[PDB]
Amino acid sequence: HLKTIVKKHLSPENFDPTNRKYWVYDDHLKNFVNFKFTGDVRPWPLSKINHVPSHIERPDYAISSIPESELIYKRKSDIYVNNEEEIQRIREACILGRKTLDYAHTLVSPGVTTDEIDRKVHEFIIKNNAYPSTLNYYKFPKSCCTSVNEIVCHGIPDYRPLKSGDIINIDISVFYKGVHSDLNETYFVGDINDVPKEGKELVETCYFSLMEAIKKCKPGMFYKNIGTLIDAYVSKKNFSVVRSYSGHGVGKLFHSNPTVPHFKKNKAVGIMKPGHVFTIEPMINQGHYSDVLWPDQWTSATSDGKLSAQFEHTLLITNNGVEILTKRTQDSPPLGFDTKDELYY
Ligand SMILES: [Fe+3]
Numbered sequence: 001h002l003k004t005i006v007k008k009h010l011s012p013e014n015f016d017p018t019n020r021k022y023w024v025y026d027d028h029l030k031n032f033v034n035f036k037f038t039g040d041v042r043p044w045p046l047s048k049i050n051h052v053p054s055h056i057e058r059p060d061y062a063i064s065s066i067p068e069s070e071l072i073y074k075r076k077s078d079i080y081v082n083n084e085e086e087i088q089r090i091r092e093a094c095i096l097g098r099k100t101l102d103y104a105h106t107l108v109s110p111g112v113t114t115d116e117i118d119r120k121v122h123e124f125i126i127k128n129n130a131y132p133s134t135l136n137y138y139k140f141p142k143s144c145c146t147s148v149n150e151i152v153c154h155g156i157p158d159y160r161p162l163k164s165g166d167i168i169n170i171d172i173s174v175f176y177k178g179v180h181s182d183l184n185e186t187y188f189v190g191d192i193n194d195v196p197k198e199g200k201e202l203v204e205t206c207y208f209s210l211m212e213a214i215k216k217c218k219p220g221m222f223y224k225n226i227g228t229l230i231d232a233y234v235s236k237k238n239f240s241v242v243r244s245y246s247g248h249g250v251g252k253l254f255h256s257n258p259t260v261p262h263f264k265k266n267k268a269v270g271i272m273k274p275g276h277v278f279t280i281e282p283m284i285n286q287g288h289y290s291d292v293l294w295p296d297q298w299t300s301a302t303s304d305g306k307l308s309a310q311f312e313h314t315l316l317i318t319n320n321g322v323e324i325l326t327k328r329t330q331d332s333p334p335l336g337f338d339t340k341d342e343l344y345y
Contacts, residue, residue, distance in 0.1 A: 040150075049135075080276070081273060082251060082316075093177060096128055098329060100174055104117060113161050114168070133174060133254050140154075145157075147310070151301055168189055181325070186310055217321070219320070220271060232264065240288060241264075246281075247261075247279040248278060285304075
């Protein structure tokens with residue numbers, strides 16, 4: 001009974017995203033039966049969880065789903081100061097995160113499913129003796145997040161094929177030598193001319209909002225000032241800043257202090273000091289700032305169904321400035337606009 005329905009109605013080649021009849025038989029789609037979507041993106045069925053070989057070191061949530069070292073009590077003012085040996089380890093995880101993102105980028109093309117991309121990303125991380133940080137983190141079922149068009153963040157890779165003209169953020173994190181790396185980029189799928197013009201401007205504005213904020217980071221600067229910089233930059237182009245998600249400390253813990261909002265007049269706690277490692281990851285919207293959480297408990301979409309774009313780096317505060325651990329390299333595929341690396345390195 002169950003097997004036939006999956007085969008006939010919930011497979012990559014025959015799933016109908018505009019018919020909810022068989023959704024009740026799929027553990028992902030059943031949450032959506034009464035849901036009113038904000039845009040054109042629909043969820044598709046997921047594939048079965050991908051295996052992790054036994055020799056790979058796992059983070060503390062891999063089995064139980066509960067990130068216990070993150071739940072250990074800390075003051076909101078407690079921000080971890082990495083030593084040289086820890087920094088080197090993070091640098092190396094970030095190098096691998098970059099390699100993994102650059103590899104995922106090469107897979108993006110019309111017709112390719114996000115699930116295909118996730119599986120190949122998973123395989124690449126495993127091949128490199130690392131663990132995909134997202135896998136089973138609060139039961140997140142995949143090894144990266146893929147957020148197309150109006151999807152703000154945490155999109156779950158599924159059987160939906162990419163269309164020429166879509167924009168897709170691919171969000172990568174890897175756990176390697178005891179530490180995490182976190183980065184992400186938004187890509188144009190297929191013919192750049194199929195992307196809505198506002199979408200090209202959106203993705204590019206978001207990118208520079210991020211790089212311009214990073215350029216100001218140094219010891220003594222308030223973490224709350226990041227949001228001041230980002231919000232001002234994107235407001236000039238009449239785009240808005242998502243409020244529901246923030247940058248975070250990263251390193252020994254997947255997510256730690258400080259919390260880093262990307263909007264102005266925020267109450268972020270902390271000043272930047274040498275040895276601090278954290279992310280800035282602004283999600284910027286074409287229209288209204290507001291997002292709705294999907295009934296899968298993970299996928300966020302813009303409330304108006306307009307486009308959203310994100311970029312993310314993992315950063316290290318140095319004695320006199322910042323270093324961008326997840327920097328692009330000569331092996332990084334193009335973003336479709338001049339990234340003006342000369343301004344930042
Ligand atoms: Fe992050």
